[PDB]
Amino acid sequence: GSSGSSGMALRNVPFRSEVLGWDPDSLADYFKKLNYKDCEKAVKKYHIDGARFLNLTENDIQKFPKLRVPILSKLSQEINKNEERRSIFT
């Protein structure tokens, strides 16, 4: 190989079905891997499960930092699109 990797930004994203079955205590781990310790905190403190992440709304974003607000809104969508195409007609 040649191209090196690190893991400190939007590079890896989980699957939707996977997040839909996550928890407000487990989802925090996902962030810990993305160097998002500021997010994982609220995820456990406010008890925000994966299902709540993908549905990041103005009511949820308010419970997040202005430094990760846009990051979570952009990430939450990345997962929704990561859903394994099976037979969705919507």
UniProtKB/Swiss-Prot annotation:
PTM statement from Swiss-Prot or TrEMBL: Phosphorylated after T-cell receptor activation by ZAP70, ITK and TXK, which leads to the up-regulation of Th1 preferred cytokine IL-2. SYK-dependent phosphorylation is required for recruitment of PI3K signaling components.
Localization of this protein: Cytoplasm
Expression sites by tissue: Highly expressed in spleen, thymus and peripheral blood leukocytes. Highly expressed also in T-cell and monocytic cell lines, expressed at lower level in B-cell lines. Not detected in fibroblast or neuroblastoma cell lines.
Highest taxon, organism lineage: Eukaryota
Modified residues (Phosphotyrosine): 30
Domain SAM span(s) in chain numbering: 22-88
Domain remark in the UniProt entry: The SH2 domain mediates interaction with phosphorylated CD6. The SH2 domain mediates interaction with SHB. Possesses an N-terminal acidic domain containing three tyrosine phosphorylation motifs, a central proline-rich region, and a C-terminal SH2 domain.
Disease: Immunodeficiency 81: An autosomal recessive disorder characterized by recurrent infections, including fungal infections, associated with T cell, neutrophil, and NK cell dysfunction. B cells may also show maturation abnormalities. Other features include autoimmune hemolytic anemia and abnormal platelet aggregation.
Record function comment: Adapter protein primarily involved in signaling pathways within T-cells, as well as other immune cells such as platelets, mast cells, and natural killer (NK) cells. Plays a crucial role for transducing signal from the T-cell receptor (TCR) after antigen recognition leading to T-cell activation. Mechanistically, once phosphorylated by the kinase ZAP70, mediates interactions with the guanine-nucleotide exchange factor VAV1, the adapter protein NCK and the kinase ITK.
Quaternary structure, from the entry: Interacts with SLA. Interacts with CBLB. Interacts with GRB2. Interacts with SHB. Interacts with PRAM1. Interacts (via SH2 domain) with CD6 (via tyrosine phosphorylated C-terminus). Interacts with FYB1 and the phosphorylated form of FYB2. Interacts with 14-3-3 adapter/YWHAZ; this phosphorylation leads to YWHAZ proteolytic degradation. Interacts with VAV1; this interaction plays a role in TCR-mediated cytokine production. Interacts with AGER; this interaction plays an important role in AGER-mediated pro-inflammatory responses and cytokine release.
Name recorded for this polypeptide: Lymphocyte cytosolic protein 2
Species of origin: Homo sapiens
Species lineage: Eukaryota, Metazoa, Chordata, Craniata, Vertebrata
Entire-sequence positions represented here: 1 to 83 of 533
